[PDB]
Amino acid sequence: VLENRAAQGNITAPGGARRLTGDQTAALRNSLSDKPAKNIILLIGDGMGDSEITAARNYAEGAGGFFKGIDALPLTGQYTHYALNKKTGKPDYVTDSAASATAWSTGVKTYNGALGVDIHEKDHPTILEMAKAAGLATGNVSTAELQHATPAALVAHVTSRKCYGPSATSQKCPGNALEKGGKGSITEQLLNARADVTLGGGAKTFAETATAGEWQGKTLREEAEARGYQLVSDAASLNSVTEANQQKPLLGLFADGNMPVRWLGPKATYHGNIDKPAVTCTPNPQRNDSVPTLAQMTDKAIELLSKNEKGFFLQVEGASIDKQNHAANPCGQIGETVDLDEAVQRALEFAKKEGNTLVIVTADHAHASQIVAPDTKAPGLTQALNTKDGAVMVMSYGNSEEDSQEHTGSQLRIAAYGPHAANVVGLTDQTDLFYTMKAALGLK
Amino acid sequence: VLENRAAQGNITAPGGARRLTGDQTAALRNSLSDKPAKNIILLIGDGMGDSEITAARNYAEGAGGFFKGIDALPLTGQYTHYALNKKTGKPDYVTDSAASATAWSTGVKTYNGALGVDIHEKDHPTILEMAKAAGLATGNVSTAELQHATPAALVAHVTSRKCYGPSATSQKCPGNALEKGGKGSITEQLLNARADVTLGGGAKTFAETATAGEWQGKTLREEAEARGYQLVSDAASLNSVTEANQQKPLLGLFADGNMPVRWLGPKATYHGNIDKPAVTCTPNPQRNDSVPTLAQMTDKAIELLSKNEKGFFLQVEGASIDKQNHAANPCGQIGETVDLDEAVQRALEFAKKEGNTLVIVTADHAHASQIVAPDTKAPGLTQALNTKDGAVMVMSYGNSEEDSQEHTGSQLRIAAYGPHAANVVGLTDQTDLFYTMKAALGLK
Ligand SMILES: [Zn+2]
Ligand SMILES: [Zn+2]
Ligand SMILES: [Zn+2]
Ligand SMILES: [Zn+2]
């Protein structure tokens, strides 16, 4: 254990690049606790593999720097996230957001595109549903649409991640279609789930009207209100909230789709590290000050949820690290990783002060981005960037000839802090995380 | 701190994919020891990042399987390995074998291509020179040429990794050239270093004659003999060795260059996963039965070295994982990872039985290979493989339009077992490893 893992001094001198100030043995032995966790905060950086963590650190903090949030969790390991082929039931080495999110929130592997159901299309309870049933307060925050697979997996059981609202569900998930006697679209099941705090984007799907049931004819936004949900649409009003519970659930819709990314930079190009000058990221001017940052949502959710005496389970997702990775946009991708680090600092500060909180930071799968040599002549999309070290770092995206770079199957880092954090060390599976949380809370 | 990390049962069923059988807390707390290490075995998988480990596991053992050696080390972490730019002294995000090997064996960062010297070209003692001085037995094994960067870094101090023997040193490392008053080429410094056990390839540089000094005119191979080295060139003779020490140092030269790779498979190609059938690796027919495997060399080295009462330091390197990665050859690369896993099992079996041995498995840097979806249309070199799961796994190499795929800068896995293993957990730097070993052995 250690809180400062930055290089000690002059990285060109003996011992200057070291991150360790002493022996971790005792410190580590002290952070090993099997006492129950009262709360759990699971932070997910979408598509944030080791490569993404390194690129952002090199850029934002420098090679020898360290993320005060992301790099500060003492217990580390690597975990696998392979999905399953629906027909064969054999492994599918590269998972999507849905199958992986389902794995950690359910404890069962599934096929790509599935939310809350195994390869047989059978429903399985998510950790959020189990926490709510035990009396704990529940939160779900993300910078993406709330209907995205990661936040949706905790509250929805759909056969296809594309079944956002009533209209998509009728054509793509008919067995789930409300009219067909199913539980409903992702959005409808989210509304039913009734988590205490739900914050993110995806307001546009709420403008759809239910095709059947008690709120038929009424838009989903209207139904939320009729059901007792407090709706907030910006930083100001969010901030104004004083409580959120089963009588007064909070629902923040901060964008029609995904919330705007924090940084602006050009898209990587073929031979860009050669033909184009080094870029320096800038703030995204299209992003309004009224739009909450992930740390803000995380912080507000912790405040409201910490009022519950039994404890709480909260999931936070920095979604656009993945989206900008697909877009081959280094600046957008790094900004979203810096953004998530902030949300991680908020969680850590709370956890260190409370003492019964298990904080976990990981990703759903690996992605395309690679850090290559400045002079690299690659076949894909590349870009040179000016880092905090005053050096150029080149990033490469070369696994797709399409407009979207692809996920990768490499095992990746999973880090934790708090009671039961030891269960994250060594090699584990994404499904283990579910059992780790279920047992830390004693949610059996 | 478990030994079996394979999926529990049916990966399609709830909990079937889990690798954990219980709670690691107690087990982990028990494997944390700060008592001094009597011995240390450092295994290096060249260019063996997390992606490489995953691809080989998926192929050789199946997605839900586990490397009995590589994946069985309980204390895990991620470490950085950026090099330095010689001019500026600023970070160079993607290191080579030379700059990284120098970092863990010396504790100082350096520029790419440097062996045993910092950016000012100043010499720094290596962990092997320090162990030998304290009376410990020393071993150095690799599947590559012994003049090659990783093994050379422990015994040579050269400004350019290209200074193999007398002839190359005169033109490329004149300040080290023996005639110019320098310490000599890599091969000459290796001969001088006099480690108890040195096994590998690179016999061809030993056919060069020294240009000055006591053994001038005499080939390097003749010099070795004149200096009291026992030369063995195949498995049978290796095996026949009964002792190796300072009076009778062992020198195994099993190949002119790098030792032959274990598996054969075709080179990945543009749209190979689409236009070509899935391949299944086979054993390399050019590889002679008389050529020792890494595990055999590792095993024999442990045997000879464990006779020293003070203890020993042994470094083992599975070098061709990297070379095949550069070559865009999945089968050669996976075979070399399986090869290394066996050497790791040997190290672990000894360590678990001896009890004062620190075993560390890591890599010098990340590489090109990525696991992508079966249908991926990538701009680079791809290939489909038939895995143990009876499923297809696609591998992609898309960071170079040249004939050699490039290294990548992503932080990677470092795993350890034994006294002082806790110093590997969390985020660390490649230079910390040096301090971890120095302190474990009390080599102050
Ligand atoms: Zn994702
Ligand atoms: Zn994605
Ligand atoms: Zn290497
Ligand atoms: Zn290499």
Swiss-Prot record, chains A, B:
Coiled coil: none annotated. Binds 1 Mg(2+) ion. Binds 2 Zn(2+) ions. SMART domains: alkPPc. Zn(2+) 1 binds at residues 322, 326, 407. Pfam families: Alk_phosphatase. Its EC number is 3.1.3.1. One of its GO terms (molecular function) is oxidoreductase activity, acting on phosphorus or arsenic in donors. Mg(2+) binds at residues 46, 148, 150, 317. Its cofactor is Mg(2+); Zn(2+). Zn(2+) 2 binds at residues 46, 364-365. It is found in: Periplasm. It catalyses: a phosphate monoester + H2O = an alcohol + phosphate. It is an enzyme of class 3 (hydrolase). GO terms for biological process: protein dephosphorylation. It comes from the Bacteria. Keywords: Disulfide bond, Hydrolase, Magnesium, Metal-binding, Periplasm, Phosphoprotein, Signal, Zinc. GO terms for cellular component: outer membrane-bounded periplasmic space; periplasmic space. The active site is at 97 (phosphoserine intermediate). Its main location: periplasm. Disulfide bonds join 163-173, 281-331. PANTHER family: ALKALINE PHOSPHATASE. Belongs to the alkaline phosphatase family. Isozymes 1 and 3 are a dimer of identical chains, isozyme 2 is a dimer of heterogeneous chains, one of each of the subunits from isozymes 1 and 3. This is Alkaline phosphatase. It comes from Escherichia coli (strain K12).
